[PDB]
Amino acid sequence: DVSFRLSGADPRSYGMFIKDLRNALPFREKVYNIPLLLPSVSGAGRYLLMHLFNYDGKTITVAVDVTNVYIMGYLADTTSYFFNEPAAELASQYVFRDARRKITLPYSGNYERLQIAAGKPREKIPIGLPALDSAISTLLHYDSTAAAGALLVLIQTTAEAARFKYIEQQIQERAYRDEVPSLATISLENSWSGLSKQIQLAQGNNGIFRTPIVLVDNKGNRVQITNVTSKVVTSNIQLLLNTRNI
Numbered sequence: 001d002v003s004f005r006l007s008g009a010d011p012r013s014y015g016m017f018i019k020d021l022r023n024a025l026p027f028r029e030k031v032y033n034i035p036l037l038l039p040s041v042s043g044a045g046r047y048l049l050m051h052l053f054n055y056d057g058k059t060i061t062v063a064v065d066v067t068n069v070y071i072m073g074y075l076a077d078t079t080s081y082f083f084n085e086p087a088a089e090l091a092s093q094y095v096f097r098d099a100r101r102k103i104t105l106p107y108s109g110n111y112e113r114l115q116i117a118a119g120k121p122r123e124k125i126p127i128g129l130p131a132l133d134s135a136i137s138t139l140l141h142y143d144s145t146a147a148a149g150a151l152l153v154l155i156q157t158t159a160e161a162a163r164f165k166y167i168e169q170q171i172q173e174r175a176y177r178d179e180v181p182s183l184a185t186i187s188l189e190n191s192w193s194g195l196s197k198q199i200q201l202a203q204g205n206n207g208i209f210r211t212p213i214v215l216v217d218n219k220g221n222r223v224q225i226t227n228v229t230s231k232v233v234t235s236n237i238q239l240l241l242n243t244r245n246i
């Protein structure tokens, strides 16, 4: 398991939690010095538990698929909550089995669906550590519309920060003041599967992308990623989604 306490949190302690989350995900191989997530994990070991505590010490436990860093669902007191998708249904067989009832949220966990359920695209929802405090407070007690926004904040501040060092640093900048994600943040979140695919294929193509990836960089500017010496591959990406799961 990994934990993050918002009470007393600072950029350093958030950075330690994201390091904890990345290190809980198993890998057998690195490709260009980046951990390659596993094709597959049978049974209960597939799911990592993240214990998150709001400013007031109230807690949720979030279940995370270790092959793709996808949040499946979460435990608040005696109620489990799962996304309306087959992989979350599967997770509910292994995690949160001492729960009084199980609510299937009325949406899948993908970004397009959560955005429709929340009524706002990610482009317009402030992110940061205070936002994660609010998200944890929202999820303690069922509210499906409120929970869509809260889940968009939870995913970006945990899973997306684990996947990209730049996103971790953007949340550190937002330790005490929320701000809509940067253009580079939304670009990287949208591009993780594509970059993961092109980095694995570059093994066999002399570190050259078979299909170049269009991103936004830290200065707001277009950058075309054509090969593995790019800063996105050498510094930024921290985990690779396995080609088998693309």
Ligand SMILES: Nc1ncnc2c1ncn2[C@H]1C[C@H](O)[C@@H](COP(=O)(O)O)O1
Pocket: 069, 070, 071, 072, 109, 110, 111, 112, 155, 159, 160, 189, 190, 191, 192, 193
């Ligand atoms: N539930 C959940 N958990 C973890 N990560 C998530 C989740 N939903 C979306 N995302 C992340 C993961 C995808 O690689 C990416 C989708 O971006 P896009 O280009 O918009 O499809 O953002």
